[PDB]
């Protein structure tokens, strides 16, 4: 899957947990950036 898809999927979880615009801020930060680095960050959840 491309990088943008695997960020939103992660973002949804936080919202179910209760983390909200801390998960939208993530949407805007990614959007502001618009490289494969995020894909590495994705693999490293923790």
């Amino acid at each position: 899957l491309p990088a943008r898809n695997k960020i939103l999927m992660l973002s949804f979880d936080l919202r179910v947990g209760g983390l909200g615009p801390k998960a939208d801020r993530l949407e805007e930060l990614v959007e502001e950036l618009e490289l494969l680095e995020v894909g590495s960050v994705l693999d490293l959840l923790v």
Partner: protein, 61 residues
């Protein structure tokens, strides 16, 4: 404008640090600096992930 490009790349790297803190992946600015400098045109990320995890599993000793 090389100094302006230096502040701009520092800004991109600061954006990636903030994301790395939100995901809570345990990476530091200098370690993020080495990892970004490596994958920029080098190794595929999905392998670097297990390499960092293995390096961190070894330092457990």
């Amino acid at each position: 404008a090389a100094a302006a490009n230096l502040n701009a790349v520092r800004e991109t790297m600061d954006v990636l640090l903030e994301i790395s803190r939100i995901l809570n992946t345990g990476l530091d600015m200098e370690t993020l600096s080495i990892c970004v400098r490596l994958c920029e045109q080098g190794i595929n990320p999905e392998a670097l992930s297990s390499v960092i995890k293995e390096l961190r599993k070894a330092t457990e000793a």
